[PDB]
Each structure stands twice: as C-alpha cells, then as structure tokens.
Nucleic acid binder design. Sequence first.
RNA 1: UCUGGUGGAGGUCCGUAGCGGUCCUGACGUGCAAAUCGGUCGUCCGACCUGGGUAUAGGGGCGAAAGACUAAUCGAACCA
RNA 2: CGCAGGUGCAGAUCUUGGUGGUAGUAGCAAAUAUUCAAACGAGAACUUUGAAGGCCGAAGUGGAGAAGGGUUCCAUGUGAACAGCAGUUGAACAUGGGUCAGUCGGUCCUGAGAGAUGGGCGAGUGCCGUUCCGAAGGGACGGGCGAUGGCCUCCGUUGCCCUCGGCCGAUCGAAAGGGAGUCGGGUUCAGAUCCCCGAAUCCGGAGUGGCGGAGAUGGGCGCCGCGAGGCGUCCAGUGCGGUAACGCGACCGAUCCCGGAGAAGCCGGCGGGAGCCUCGGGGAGAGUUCUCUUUUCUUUGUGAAGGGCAGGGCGCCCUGGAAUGGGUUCGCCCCGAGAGAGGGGCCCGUGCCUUGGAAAGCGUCGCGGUUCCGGCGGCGUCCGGUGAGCUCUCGCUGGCCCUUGAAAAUCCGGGGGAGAGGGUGUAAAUCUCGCGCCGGGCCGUACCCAUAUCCGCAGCAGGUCUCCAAGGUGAACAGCCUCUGGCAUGUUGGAACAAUGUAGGUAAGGGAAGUCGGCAAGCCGGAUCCGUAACUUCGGGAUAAGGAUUGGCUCUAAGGGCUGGGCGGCCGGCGCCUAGCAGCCGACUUAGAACUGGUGCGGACCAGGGGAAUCCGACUGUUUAAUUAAAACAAAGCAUC
RNA 3: GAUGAACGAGAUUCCCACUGUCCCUACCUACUAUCCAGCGAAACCACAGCCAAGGGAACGGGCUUGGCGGAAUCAGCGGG
RNA 4: GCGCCAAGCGUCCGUCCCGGCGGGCGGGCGCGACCCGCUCCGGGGACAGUGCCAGGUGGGGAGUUUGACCGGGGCGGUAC
RNA 5: CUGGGUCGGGGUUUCGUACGUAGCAGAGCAGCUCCCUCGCUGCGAUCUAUUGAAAGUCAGCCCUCGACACAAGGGUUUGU
RNA 6: CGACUCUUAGCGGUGGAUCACUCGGCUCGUGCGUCGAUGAAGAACGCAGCUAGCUGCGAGAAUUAAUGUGAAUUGCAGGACACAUUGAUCAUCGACACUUCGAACGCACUUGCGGCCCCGGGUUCCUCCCGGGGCUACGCCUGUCUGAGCGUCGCU
Lengths: 59, 50, 114
Amino acid sequence: FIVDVKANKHQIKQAVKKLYDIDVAKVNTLIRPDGEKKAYVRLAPDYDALDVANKIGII
Amino acid sequence: SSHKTFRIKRFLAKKQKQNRPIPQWIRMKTGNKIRYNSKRRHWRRTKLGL
Amino acid sequence: VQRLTYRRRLSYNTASNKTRLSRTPGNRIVYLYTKKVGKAPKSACGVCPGRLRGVRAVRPKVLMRLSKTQKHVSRAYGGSMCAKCVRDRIKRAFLIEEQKIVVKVLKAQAQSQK
RNA sequence: UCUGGUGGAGGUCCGUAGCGGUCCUGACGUGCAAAUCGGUCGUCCGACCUGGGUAUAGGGGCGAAAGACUAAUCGAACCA
RNA sequence: CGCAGGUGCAGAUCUUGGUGGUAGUAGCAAAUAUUCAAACGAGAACUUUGAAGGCCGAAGUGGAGAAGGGUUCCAUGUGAACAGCAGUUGAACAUGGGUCAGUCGGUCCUGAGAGAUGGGCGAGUGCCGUUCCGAAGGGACGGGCGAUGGCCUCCGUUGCCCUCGGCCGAUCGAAAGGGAGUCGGGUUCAGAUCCCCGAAUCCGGAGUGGCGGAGAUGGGCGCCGCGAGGCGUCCAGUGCGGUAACGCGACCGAUCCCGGAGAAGCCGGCGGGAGCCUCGGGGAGAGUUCUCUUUUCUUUGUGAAGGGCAGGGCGCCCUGGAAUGGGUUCGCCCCGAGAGAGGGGCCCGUGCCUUGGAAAGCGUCGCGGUUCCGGCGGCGUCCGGUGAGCUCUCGCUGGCCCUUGAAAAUCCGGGGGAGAGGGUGUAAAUCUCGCGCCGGGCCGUACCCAUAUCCGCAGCAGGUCUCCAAGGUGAACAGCCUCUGGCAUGUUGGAACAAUGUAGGUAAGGGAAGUCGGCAAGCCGGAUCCGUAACUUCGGGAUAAGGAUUGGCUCUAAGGGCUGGGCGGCCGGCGCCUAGCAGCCGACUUAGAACUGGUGCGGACCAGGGGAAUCCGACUGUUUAAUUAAAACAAAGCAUC
RNA sequence: GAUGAACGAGAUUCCCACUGUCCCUACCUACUAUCCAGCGAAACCACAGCCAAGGGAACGGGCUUGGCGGAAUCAGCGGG
RNA sequence: GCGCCAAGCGUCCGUCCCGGCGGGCGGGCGCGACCCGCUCCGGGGACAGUGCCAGGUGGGGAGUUUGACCGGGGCGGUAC
RNA sequence: CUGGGUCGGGGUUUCGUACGUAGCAGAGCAGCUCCCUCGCUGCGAUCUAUUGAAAGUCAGCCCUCGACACAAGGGUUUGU
RNA sequence: CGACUCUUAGCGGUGGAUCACUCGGCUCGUGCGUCGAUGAAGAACGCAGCUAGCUGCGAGAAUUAAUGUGAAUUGCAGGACACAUUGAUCAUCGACACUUCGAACGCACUUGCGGCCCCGGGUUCCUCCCGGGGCUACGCCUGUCUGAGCGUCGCU
C-alpha cells in the first residue's frame, strides 16, 4: 500500500484490518524518494493475499 | 550520502518531482505561452541550493 | 584468495569495529563482529594488583542477566574483596579491639592506684 | 682489566607507504592544470602524518616570524 | 503659425548586441596495443558475442564503505540536441520501476566546548556569566490520617501529615569515543545481518500468583500399628559442600555506606589460536600427450547461541622447609614476606567434538517435466605433515616520559540490618533457577566513492578519510613477471618517417680543453670475506679510503624432534639404558671441495662515486601555498628583569 | 669574541675516477610536427605590407628622387 | 579494620486486651546531646574601592603635516 | 625479338656449430648384484661426432628465367 | 579561356536594426488609512482525471457553505445541471474549515523524549501495550490558596 507519511506500523495495521476485514502478521515501512510511505503488509497464514487482492480489485 | 535526515530527504523528493517536462496538452490551451520547462535541472550540471 | 569487506557502514578500524574470520556452511569466509573483552573485578583493598577469582569477566551490561552465583564468592566481602585482605581485616579488627581493652584497663587501674 | 656472547637504546643512519618540494633554472607556459608533469631529490618513532568535532574574526585573529596565513583576495579580508 | 525638449555621433582601451580576416589555421601527441570473424542494424575503426595478442599485477585499472552528490541505480525505447571523431552507445533524452530492521546505525551519554534562568551590566537590540549575589527538592523505603475501586473477611488507587533528600544545577555537543541484543541458507532487472526459510537472542511487561523446582518440610516425648507406618504434644528450620583457593540450580531484605566494571599512552621482545601460503597422498572434473610426464590446473564446508574437552594464563590455595643456594627466560626475573617438589582452585576459551547438521551449500554424473519446479536421483565433500613464514587476535613480560596518556550515562558486587513470613501446615514471605505467554514504535538504508556520479566553470594528468590483500624472484607492502577480479590505452582514426622539437640511447682518440660554475649526463652501487686515516665532544668519522669473490652442476661436513628401553597382562630374585644406543620423523641454512662455460655470473630488476680543505649554522626541526628551503626562524643551554 | 667533532637538497677551491660539457659532430628509437577523413578555436587587426638615400617629431610600408614591380599557394624561419 | 538512621534511664497515653493499681500489645515526650548572649566563621576597614573633576606620563592608539625655485630630482645654494 | 610481379633455387654476406641421435667423454652420486663386490642400470651441468652446422639475407643486395597467376584495361582534358 | 581578387546591381542567406503596436512602467493627484498568542509577517511540505512552472488553495486542499447572477467550463475526456420538486459558471463573501515551522508556547530541534487528567481497543481498574482527546512556555496585573521569617506585636 501507499500510506500517509504520518502513520506508524500500529496505525497501518489497525487501518488495513478495519477496512478490509483481514488479520495482519507484520508490517514493514519504507519512505520512497518520491516522498510517500510504502507499507509491506504481510497477512496472517489463514488469509490469502490473492483472494484479498481480488476483493479489493487490484488484480 | 546514504545517511541523510528526514528534512533533507523530503527536500530532495520535491526537487525530484518538479524535474518533469511540460505536458503536451498545455501547448493547446488558449493563450498559451509556454513551450518547454525552462526550470529543468540536471544533477551533473547544476547543483542544489542544499 | 578471497578478500573480505565490512558488513556494516563503519569503515574505520575503531575499538567497536573489531572482527574475526569465520567459515560458513556455504564455504565462504565472512567477518564476525566481536564483543569487547571483559575484566573481572579488582579488589576493594587497593593493594592487590590481580583480579578477583570466581567472577566472570564480562562486559558490565551483560552482568545483569547472569545469576548471583556467577557474580560473587561465598564469603564475607565475596565478589568485592580478595580473601587475603579479608583475612587481614579480620585480624586487624580483632587485634586493635584487643589493644583498646588493654589500654582502657591499664588507664583505669592506673587511675585507681593513683 | 681484557675477551666472547646476550640485550635492544636513540628528536640514530639507508630506505618503502606517507609527508614535503632541491636541481634540471627540464616539460608545459592561449597548459592536463588561474602552480600541473617527469627524472632527480629531503624526511620517514617523531618538535611525525592525517579525518571529524571544537575555539580564536578584520586595526581583529593566528603566526618555530616569511608581513606569512586568515575560502584563487592580505603591508588590515569579503559584503552592502 | 506658435509652444516644449531626455533633440543630430567616427572616435571616449565608450555601453549592449551582431559579424569578419585570421582559418578549414592552431589543435584533437602524459600513463606499451591492438587483430580476425560473426550478430543486430539504413549505416560499424569505436556497440555486443566468440577467438587471439597485451595491460592493471593484491600499497591494483580488484572487491567494499565514510564525506559529498541526489536518482546519477535498474529495465525498455529514441538517436533531435549534448558526451570536442563516430556511435546501433551513455552518468544524454523519454516512459516505467526500485531503498522493507527490536538484535546495522541515528536515537541515549558525556568530551573539547556551546548555552538559558538567578544575578550583574547595559541608552538599547541585548551582553557577561554556568555556580558564581537564588527560599533552586514536586521525589521516595516506610508509617499515620481520610476518600475511592475491585475475583470486596481483604487488597489496591487517590489526597493530607511525619520520615528520609547535595544534583557537587536547565539544556545542547560524536552516523570514527562509550553504548544490552542475529546469524546461516535462498531469493531481485535493480533490496536485504532488513524479504522467505531455519535456528537463536536482548530488553520491557505480566497485578488478578502461568506451570515446575527452591525456600521446605527434621528432631524429642510418648500411643497404636507384629513390626513398617500412622495419632497427640513440644522444639527447630531466610539452602548446602570443600582445611583452603572456591564450588553447587535458586538460595529474602530498605534508607545509608564502600568498591568494581564502563575506563585507558607509545615502543620492543617472546608465546598461544585462527585465516592465508606451503608439502606429501586419496577422490571428482579439466588441460597436454610430436616425445616424456603415474603428470599439470581447479575443487575437496559446518553460522550464532548452548554442552563437553583440549589449549593458554594466574602476585590463587594446601602440605613442606631450601647454602654445597636453587628455580628459570630469547631478555629477564623469583624465593624464610615461603624457592624447588607434589596436589588442587579460578579465569579465558574466537580452537576441536557435539545439538544446530545435512534435510542445506558446493563438485561431479544422469533422468524429468516445461522457462521455472531451492525439480528428482547416484556418488563425494577424505587422510596427513610442516614453519623466526605473512596478517589478525589473545596473552605474558619489559623499555620511555620535567609527556603518565578522557568523562558521563549504564550495569554489578559487597558492608549493615530498619523490616517481612509461618506456627508444623503440606505451610508463608521470598527466588538473580528451569520452562511457558505478550510487545519492541520514529528516522536512514538504491547507487558513485573517482584518470566519468564529490570539489576544481568540464567525463579537468590536480585534490579528497578508510577496510581486505595470492604465486615466483628477493631483506622487503622495492622493482619485474604471473593467478582471482578488472580493462580497452585514457575526448578520434589512416598513411608517411622531412626539418626543428619532447623523451630514451649509443659513440672512435682525447678526457672539463666547454661553461659564471662538472649544469646535465656519466662513474659507484647488492651481499660475503679482508682492510680502514686525519680529527674528535671518545659517542663517532665509517658503506671512510683500498682489495678480493660472486654463474651452473655434482658432492662433503656441521647444525634437530619423538618413542623405547630385563591375544594382552604382571606376583616376582632372576634384568642394568650409564664413552648415549636403536628405530622412526623433519625443515631451513652455513662452510669446504671437485668439475664446468668464448673469464661470463648482485648477467634483467633493485642498487652510496670518492678524497683534501675554507665560510656559515651546533645537531633533529620550521619557513615566504603560486619565483627566495637559506647562513633566515625555532631549539636545548647561558643570563637579565 | 675565538674555536670546534657530528650533521647540511647551504656558499667556495683543488685532486682521483668518470664521462658527447667540449674538440665535432653522427646514427638509432618512441611521440609530434607532415599529408588525409571527421571536428574545430584564440590572441591580434587605422589602412596595409619589396628596398636605398633624402628631408621630416632629428631611425618611413606610405611622402620626394632613384632601384623596380607578375595570379594562387605549401613547409620552415625568427631580420623587421 | 568498624563507626549514621540511640542504647539506657525518667515520665504520659490508648477510642487496645488480661487479673485504682499491676501484666501484655502498640505508641508520645524529656534527658542522654547543658544555659544564655543580636550580627554563620575568620581576615581587613572608614582605608581599599566606586562615581566626578584636576595635574603628570602616554607613538600603546588616532588624525594630519613634512614649502618653492632648480639645464631631471636629491645634496648644495636663495637668483623667494 | 614478350614484360613485370610472387614464390622457389643459386651467389653474396651475418652470427657462430641447431633439434634429435650416438658416445667406451664427464666432477661425482644412488640402486641391483653376489650377499656383498666384478659388472649392469639410472641421475648428472658440461664435452665430442653427426655439424663452418642451424638460422636470416632487399624489404632500396646480385643472377635466375624453374613454377604460379596476371598484364591492350580504367578516368579527365587538350586544335594552328 | 579559366581560377582568384575588386566594384556595382538583382536574388538568396550567418543577423535582428527601423517603423507601427502595448493587459507595462514612471510621475502627479484624490479617498481611505486595517497586522499579531482567537497565533501575524515570512518560510516548508503538500493538494487537480490527465498538470511540471506561475496562480489558487490546506487533509473539506485549483476548494465547502451562503447570497447575487442565470446556462456554461473547455486543451482532451467524463458526467452534472431534466436550464423550478430552484441552478452550470462567474462574482461577492458575513458561515464553516484552515498541515508543519515561525514572536512560537511541555523539554529539545533529531518526525528525539516526557508528565497529569480522560476516552476506545487488547487484559481487565498492571493502568502493562496500541490509538485518540484536553492541558503542560516567559514576563506581568487584580484576586485566591498554601507558606516563610531570632520582622513588629497581642493573648498565653
């Protein structure tokens, strides 16, 4: 995801859980040279990333 | 260097995003006078104020 | 011969950049960053040049995750004073107190007889 | 007292890296370079060389002292 | 017709812009070097692939970082402009993409220093000042006095009062100082100790005890029980072992006090460990085979964290009492303040084995599906020897100093004993022991790191802080050649070989006659064996000066380590190692000799010409960056104020 | 002030050795210069550019009087 | 060597217990550790010092000047 | 009445006896042997013969004429 | 003959003078004459479907609401507005909103570290973890509370 720069991993994990109804294992954070924050959100083993991506519409 | 502060990185981010060419449809706007981006900056030629 | 590179961004041979050579299961030689050598406690007496016995020579902050037996010797002034000077203070305390009783008795007897 | 060993001192000698810069009054001299290049040279455990961080600001600083250096500017810098 | 001016240019080394001749001229000459073929393509001296020939030659033209740069990184496309020839190419242009951390840093601590408040000064913005002219504590064992909430008999949270209490003062200051804790394998076009797999670890929290273990479960009097073993009563129990050094899995405890660690220079010499190099064999693959070579080349693992064992060290302990002094080091050094001898203890353990672990990695030989399956399978990943070898590191022990070579956060140990716990339960307070549960937020992270990503106006022979560092020759990190890795000769090519030049050589006979002057060049040069003067501050001068040798080959002599001493043992007189004998193992040199070459041999490379004097400065050191390196300055010493 | 071992990229004289410093120059090598394809400057410039004498601001390319003078160029050169 | 956070006395309590006094349990105060006296202790002192004026010294510092004529200027002369 | 090239021959000339083979030459050394010393074998710089041999020689040397292919082709101009 | 050189004219070009124009200046004059701890000026970073700069804006970001107006905006696209079951655009602007620095305000200038009181979620009054909200700067005035003083006194 691309997230707000003023957002830590706790806020990112809670948000992804709230609007997508999924469980998060861990979150990794990066700030790109563009200036925006990139979050790598690994999901729990029960949830499938491809199925979640289909429901969101990114694939 | 790799070791940089957040303030410097955000400053370099902005200069990176504003180093783009003029869009093509701007030339078609009524009463247009811009032909190219005259503020293009090359890293080797001109150095940043920082 | 394979040549090595630093695994960290410190490029200087400082006291906190010391390394050793280790051979990996991948048959490669890599740097391993080593901890500083600890020192055992020095005796509180101030006259013994050697370190104390029975106490691990580790860096001070690691000392708090060891058990108490690794940090002391089973004796009065165990992990802070050597045995030799503990012995000397037992005798020094006893003999000076003995002299004080003798002096007090001698001055009391002299006062009574004079 | 002499001899043979051992020992490893020194602002010690030859001499690398490093630091410097003698002579050719060599090269270049609208240069590679608003001071560089080659051979040859001085020193190379010490008054040694060096990074970063700190302090001293213009009639002031700093000077193993050449009026030297103080951002290609110094017998008082630069800016307005 | 009147009115009013910023009203007339050839000049001013005039100002701004534009343009000529020079001139298709100067130039595109620092660091050895390119060639053949093919591919893509309109187009190739310059791109890519392959094959040759060369270079950097590990103090690299290699692999990585710090500053600085800021997207230059990566893929695709273009060939307008730029990259001083081209270009199918680029650090150019365009379109997309790329930097993932509790355990790598920042963040925290103080250093040199910077800097508020109090105070003082100051017309004033403000300045001095950092403990100095301040009532500078806002916290806490604990106790009491009240409210409140709960798994509410009781405990906990919150206000007030006693008790304690020096901040020896805010705060800032290091991406090289201090500072707990992560390492193997795989994965990308570009990320990675950060992602995946695996195995660990530190810190914090757990109240309503998470489970165990410890504390901690004995003794006396009796009674019953055949007796064991149970019933009543009474008294213990904040652990235990070793003579000791100290040890064991825990092993209560506050204010207060003492101490330790963090936390220390430079140089030398020895020793231990590892990595690298080396030597002898065994595998697997490859090269050569015109002749030989059982050959030559490559490769031949086990992370952290635990457990055990070597090994290293010790001013640690016990017995004991030494001169006919002994022990002992390369050097030293040690002993009645306790040597030698014997027996223990501790610390470190980066080494070996082991869990991790072979399931993974690598080598090699095959079999599959399809672009990727960490596909599948077989075999292997072995046994030794050396050393003043190089590097790193751990130790021990010395030398030098009118030089003595940080601080603070942070962590620990001890002294004391204010307190707490329970009356004999299967118990309490308590536990730095074993396992179990939860969390670790913010920022940096791509790439260049320089004869093309930094500064010098640029792809500028300049400048710019570090880390790793193979073979041969040899004193060597010297120079010369080579391997791993890298490159395309440094902003162009073709042809020719004139003058003058820049750089490198040679020269008959003289031998400084040249010139201000031996400037420049040349002579000498290494090592071994001889031999060395005047003078002198006795240290030196000194490689003084002068002479001889030096190759190749074949031998000789000397210089060491281990083991043993009359099927398997052993109760034994019966043996005697004693001019140190036998066997086995091993590396590096030194000296001497014979032979031998067209007298050539430190055969390249590396590599002091010397002597007799005068002047100045004692010496080492320093100086005008960019014309003066000197006799100038400094200096120890002397003297004065 | 005088002296003085050791030292000195300090100034000087002589001697041995050695030599292209010289008599007296020559030959060889690499890179240039040269010519070509491609690229492509700058300084400088009143107009320009053959001499002798004269006079002249007393040393002329220009003026006077003589000598004379023939497109366009190349490589060198240092009198002007 | 160790040394603090009172032992010991003398009294006063309990809304506390067990037989007005006693015992137990938990507390308080005084002495131990004297009283009084106006500046914490000590050293100077109407001096030093500060503010204002006056005299001296003051190239440490500031600003400025350092004639003219002249067979070039200077020196010399004065024909100023 | 051929020609000039390219190879190849031969002459000239430079250096100084090539590789291989053989040796009863070679300072010496090791092994077998008999069971212990005749011989044989091997290592070994170098030496002797083959061998004034081998190698180079116009590219700006001399004569060939033996082999091989090639040489009547191309472009631009010039008139009393 | 040419070539070369010189001059003139025509035409063509390295060039951008002259003329004409001007949503710009300069000068004079008139009326107003208003910033900020309720956070100013000035910085920083962001915000458009395609948008770099200028401009406008602030997480509601090239704008929301309201009023007036009355059919557009426009470079392309898309869909509003049926053009009264009341509204495109523009103007005005009194409502709402207004990120981070900055006098700049919890301490410090690094996306560093706190404290007190509340709210929600994990566990349940560990306030242990995460998220959110309100406070937490200096000087100074009136009042308030709590205090100090061998300062002056009174009752004891």
